[PDB]
């Protein structure tokens, strides 16, 4: 119930290999934060520059705290230098297997 | 690896309760298909009409075979009566924890 899922859709403008390298360090940063549960970076099949990240947090407060960390800035900056994003925060309604 | 992840973004134009009920039946239909791994239906926080579904399949062929089932067609008809959607098929690039 409390758990939140942040979903980002990226359009990569720069080199996808550089994007992935930057994202790996971004994810490691977030993995150091209290409340981090898991993440998966997905790449669209047959597209080169289309990515979706799914990140799970114990609660909304922990997610907001992570974004507000001073340590996030270089990662946020490096990501924005390479891509644009459309994103939203979600709660789970249904899961299978149950 | 071989796993594929299908991501759907729904904009619901009917009643959300009816959408969730019809979606549950469609999800059950896919859950019976060979190669189905898991799915999660997510609802955007502070919104009534925005959902994202994430579904994992063992491989691309299993996903294709499921989509091609004649039984899918009336399910699709019912779900699309209540919602529009934008979707894509993805491969996992990074996951934490490892
Ligand atoms: Cl800046
Ligand atoms: Cl069938």
Swiss-Prot record, chains A, B:
Residues 4-90 form the ABM domain. It comes from Streptomyces nogalater. The record marks 8, 53, 57 as: Important for catalytic activity. One of its GO terms (biological process) is antibiotic biosynthetic process. Involved in the biosynthesis of the anthracycline (aromatic polyketide) antibiotic nogalamycin. Catalyzes the oxygenation of 12-deoxy-nogalonic acid at position 12 to yield nogalonic acid. The chain holds residues 11 to 108 of 118 of the full protein. Keywords: Antibiotic biosynthesis, Oxidoreductase. This is Deoxynogalonate monooxygenase. It catalyses: deoxynogalonate + O2 = nogalonate + H2O + H(+). The gene is snoaB. Homodimer. Changing residue 80 to Q: Moderate decrease of catalytic efficiency. One of its GO terms (molecular function) is oxidoreductase activity, acting on single donors with incorporation of molecular oxygen, incorporation of one atom of oxygen (internal monooxygenases or internal mixed function oxidases). Pathway: Antibiotic biosynthesis. Changing residue 57 to F: Loss of monooxygenase activity. Its EC number is 1.13.12.22. It comes from the Bacteria.
């Amino acid at each position: 119930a409390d758990e939140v899922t942040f979903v980002n859709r990226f359009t990569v403008h720069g080199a996808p290999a550089e994007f992935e390298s930057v994202f790996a360090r971004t994810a490691a940063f977030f993995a150091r934060q209290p409340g981090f549960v898991r993440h998966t970076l997905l790449r669209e099949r047959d597209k080169d520059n289309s990515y979706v990240n799914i990140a799970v947090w114990t609660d909304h407060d922990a997610f907001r705290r992570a974004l507000a960390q001073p340590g996030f800035l270089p990662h946020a900056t490096a990501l924005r230098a390479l891509s644009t994003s459309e994103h939203g925060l979600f709660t789970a309604r249904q899961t299978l297997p149950e």
